[PDB]
């Protein structure tokens, strides 16, 4: 069965990419824009933006390898390895023209290498709500005067003995609500039903493992990006971040200025990590305006 409701005018489909069967939801007409979700979620986080973008663009929203309805990767979970799959998927649908890319959270980790390595293929770029993996992330505090930090999960998820799978198995719904709401300012939008849907998807045993394998590969992605970042990004770029509890604040744009020559940024007040759901109206407006200019 489909894990999430598909909007009218969109199709749920699959494509084999380098031996890995990727799930995506596609609709609209025109130049291609690919939307890439992040941790704890699936293509469905984009379901409010997709019909609006589909008025002017062909829109494709894949499930990351191992998450949603996509098969796990065959190579590995580092950013360079996963970006191969996403690049080839986008190029199957836009072989003769560059495409636009919008990415959220670890979607950034899993697309940055193919952006920097195939710059001619990317017309415009939108990155929101996560650091590109580099040594800046080693400075985030573990514990705060406000209590539980927003980043202690980096170490928990990365632990090489699969501690996270071991402890969260059987408690997937409790943990996901904790994680999502503690990174949200607008907690109201995360209803019992929405959390149930996301929890069922990432509780699939291979998806729970895949979720944390992205973090187990994070230091490898850092090492990869230290080489890749010697070439700066030249296409027009926009960053978005939440300015409320749970967000990246000014860090998103400040980091991106070290990676991109042509970058504008926005911080959305009263919004946390989950921008498409917490602050859909202003976020959708910014993304559509940036891509439509």
């Amino acid at each position: 069965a489909e894990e999430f409701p598909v909007p009218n005018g969109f199709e749920s489909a699959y494509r084999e990419v380098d031996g890995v069967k990727l799930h995506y939801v596609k609709g609209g007409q025109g130049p291609l824009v690919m939307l890439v979700h992040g941790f704890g979620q699936t293509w469905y986080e984009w379901h409010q933006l997709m019909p609006e973008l589909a008025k002017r663009f062909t829109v494709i929203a894949p499930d990351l390898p191992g998450l949603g309805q996509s098969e796990p990767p065959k190579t590995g979970y580092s950013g360079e390895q996963v970006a191969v799959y996403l690049h080839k998927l986008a190029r199957q649908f836009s072989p003769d023209r560059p495409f636009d890319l919008v990415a959220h959270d670890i979607g950034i980790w899993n697309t940055y290498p193919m952006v920097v390595k195939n710059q001619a293929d990317i017309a415009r770029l939108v990155y929101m709500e996560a650091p590109i993996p580099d040594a800046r992330i080693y400075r985030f505090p573990a514990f705060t005067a406000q209590g539980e930090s927003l980043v202690w999960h980096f170490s928990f998820f990365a632990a090489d003995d699969r501690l996270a799978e071991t402890l969260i198995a059987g408690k997937e719904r409790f943990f996901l609500e904790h994680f999502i709401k503690s990174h949200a300012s607008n907690t109201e939008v995360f209803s019992e039903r929405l959390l149930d849907l996301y929890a069922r998807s990432y509780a699939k045993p291979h998806s729970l493992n895949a979720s944390f394998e992205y973090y187990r590969a994070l230091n490898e992605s850092v090492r990869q990006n230290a080489e890749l970042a010697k070439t700066r990004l030249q296409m027009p770029t926009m960053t978005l971040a939440g300015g409320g509890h749970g967000g990246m604040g000014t860090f998103q744009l400040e980091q991106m200025k070290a990676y991109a020559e042509d970058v504008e940024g926005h911080v959305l007040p009263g919004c946390g990590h989950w921008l498409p759901e917490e602050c859909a109206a202003p976020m959708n407006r910014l993304v559509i305006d940036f891509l439509s200019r």
Partner: nanobody
Amino acid sequence: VKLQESGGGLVQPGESLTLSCAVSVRLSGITTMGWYRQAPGKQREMVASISRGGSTVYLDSVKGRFTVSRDNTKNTVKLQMNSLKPEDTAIYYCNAKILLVASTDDYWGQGTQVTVS
């Protein structure tokens, strides 16, 4: 993010006051709201704070007398001050802390004078 306190004034011992703080962003986007007071020449003290989940911290000498609360409908924070005493005279400030990934944001209102005489 902008905060504006109101509700201060001059009262006699044993009376009550209600301070309120208006917040320009969604209140659940504020990790901690803390009421601070400052009397002339004294060290500032944290009177009452409330996390967005509702955990409270109170200055010992106001426990049982003061109560801090959040009103997510009106998007305000309140400090109910009962059994006021001369020791409570001070300027009262509201402080908003916003926990982010790399740092914690810090915002303040301009304050309101409370005088118990």
